[PDB]
Structures are given as structure tokens and as C-alpha cells.
From Swiss-Prot:
Designated name of the protein: Aphrodisin
Species assigned in the record: Cricetus cricetus
Known function: Acts as an aphrodisiac pheromone, reliably eliciting copulatory behavior from male hamster.
InterPro entries in the cross-refs: Calycin (IPR012674), Lipocalin (IPR002345), Lipocalin_CS (IPR022272), Lipocln_cytosolic_FA-bd_dom (IPR000566), OBP-like (IPR002448)
Localization in the cell: Secreted
Keyword Coiled coil tagged: no
Main localization (coarse): secreted
Keywords for the protein's UniProt record, in alphabetical order: Disulfide bond, Glycoprotein, Pyrrolidone carboxylic acid, Secreted, Signal
Length: 149
């Protein structure tokens, strides 16, 4: 998981509860950076979300557990882990349990800046099928990444 360290942007996000990741949704986030500590057992994530119609730069810490997942508190409880890592992309799975108890299953693809290639899109589709997330719920987040670098 040490391969997680560096500058990253959110390229695509897919979720079973689509309203969570559309504009205005609490889980629509725009990565900026991941810093790893202690052989990446602590993963600090820096990102932007829009809150009250303003860009809100945020940091949270993901804590690695014995089961190989990371837990972080943000808009509820999150349980996430990399599904597949390359030098220019990270495909993560995340399960969010909000404060009402609603569970949302998501796939987040982080990248260095470019849109996904055809092969990367195929990998994403295979993951969406495996996780039971509709392909019509795959959103292009890079297109609306408007907050400061």
C-alpha cells in the first residue's frame, strides 16, 4: 500500500446510491494527495468537497486494520481498500455508513489527471459488475474538479 503515496485526482466515482455522488452529494470528493505513514498503516488523504457552495479543503486519516481495510470517519464511517494499483491509477472500493445508518457501496478511481483509457474503463466495468454497482452510476468527476490545485 506504500504505492498509494503522492499527488492524485478523482477521475471517476461509481456508487449504488447515486445521489451520494452527484453534485451536492456528500461523497463527491476531489482528491489532491495521499501521504503514507508507518508502511502506509496510516493514510492521510487530502481532498476537496463542496460544502455550502464553497470549496472546502479537507484532510482525514485512514487507519489500516488487521483485515487489510482502512477505516476513516467522514460523512459517516468509511471502510475502504485498494482493489488495483498502477503507477498512474488507483481503483478503490469504499463502503460508507452514514449517520442515519444507510450503507453506500462505491468505487473510486484516482489518477494523475487524465481521463481513463479504454482498458482502464474495462477494468472499472469489471469491478462495477463484481461489486453490483450499475454501470449507469459511473460518474465523470474529473470534468467538474473546479477547486484550487
Amino acid at each position: 500500500f506504500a504505492e498509494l503515496q503522492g499527488k492524485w485526482y478523482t477521475i471517476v466515482i461509481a456508487a449504488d446510491n447515486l445521489e451520494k455522488i452527484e453534485e451536492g452529494g456528500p461523497l463527491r470528493f476531489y482528491f489532491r494527495h495521499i501521504d503514507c505513514y508507518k508502511n502506509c498503516s496510516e493514510m492521510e488523504i487530502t481532498f476537496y468537497v463542496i460544502t455550502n457552495n464553497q470549496c472546502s479543503k479537507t484532510t482525514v486519516i485512514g487507519y489500516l486494520k488487521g483485515n487489510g481495510t482502512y477505516e476513516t470517519q467522514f460523512e459517516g464511517n468509511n471502510i475502504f481498500q485498494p482493489l488495483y494499483i498502477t503507477s498512474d491509477k488507483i481503483f478503490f472500493t469504499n463502503k460508507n455508513m452514514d449517520r442515519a445508518g444507510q450503507e453506500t457501496n462505491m468505487i473510486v478511481v484516482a489518477g494523475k489527471g487524465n481521463a481513463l483509457t479504454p482498458e482502464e474503463n474495462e477494468i472499472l466495468v469489471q469491478f462495477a459488475h463484481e461489486k453490483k454497482i450499475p454501470v449507469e452510476n459511473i460518474l465523470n468527476i474529473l470534468a467538474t474538479d473546479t477547486c484550487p490545485e
